[PDB]
């Protein structure tokens, strides 16, 4: 169902959270080669998450689950903030700008939290 598909999306989102936290520790320890690999893996994981979230939203729309559509619309907006800041972080890494990377990483932790509160309601709504 859409509900089991959202559980699959949630796990993928949580796989990115785990990798992100591993990457943060690598950045702090100054392991740049590891960071580069983790950033590539994260991009793949976010692209997958986005794909799954869009299909779920489109399905909720076709099913007429108005409360779920409202919540998912809010979450897709938050997801795009994540995307914009993530891309900025990757650019900061490419440019050798550790100050911006630090800033963007702290910002993404805020986005993740505000997304998590929204994701928990979506699950209950589908």
Q: What is the dihedral of CA 16, 20, 23, 27, to 10 degrees?
A: 160
> Which residue of the chain is nearest ligand LVF when measured via CB?
82
Helix then strand count (H, E) for the chain reads 4, 0
Q: Footprint of ligand LVF on residues 5-34 (CB under 6 A)? A: none
Distance CA 107, CA 86 (A): 9
- Which residues in the chain precede a discontinuity of more than 2.5 Å between C and N? none
Total residues contacting ligand LVF by CB under 6 A comes to 11
Considering only residues 6, 27, 79, 101, which one is a binding residue for ligand LVF as defined by CB under 6 A? 79
Q: Footprint of ligand LVF on residues 29-48 (CB under 6 A)? A: 43, 46-47
Q: Is position 82 an interface residue for ligand LVF (rule: CB under 6 A)?
A: yes
Q: Is position 119 an interface residue for ligand LVF (rule: CB under 6 A)?
A: no
Where do contacts with ligand LVF occur on this chain (CB under 6 A)? Answer: 43, 46-47, 50, 79, 82-83, 86, 108, 111-112
């Amino acid at each position: 169902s859409v509900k089991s598909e959202y559980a699959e999306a949630a796990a993928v989102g949580q796989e990115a959270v785990a990798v992100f936290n591993t990457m943060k520790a690598a950045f702090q320890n100054g392991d740049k080669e590891a960071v580069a690999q983790y950033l590539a893996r994260l991009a793949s994981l976010y692209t997958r998450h986005e794909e799954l979230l869009n299909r779920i939203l489109e399905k909720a729309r076709r099913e007429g689950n108005k409360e779920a559509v409202t919540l998912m619309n809010e979450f897709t907006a938050t997801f795009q903030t994540g995307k914009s800041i993530f891309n900025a972080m990757v650019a900061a890494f490419k440019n050798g700008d550790d100050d911006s990377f630090e800033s963007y990483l702290q910002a993404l932790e805020k986005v993740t939290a505000k997304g998590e509160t929204l994701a928990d309601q979506i699950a209950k709504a589908l």
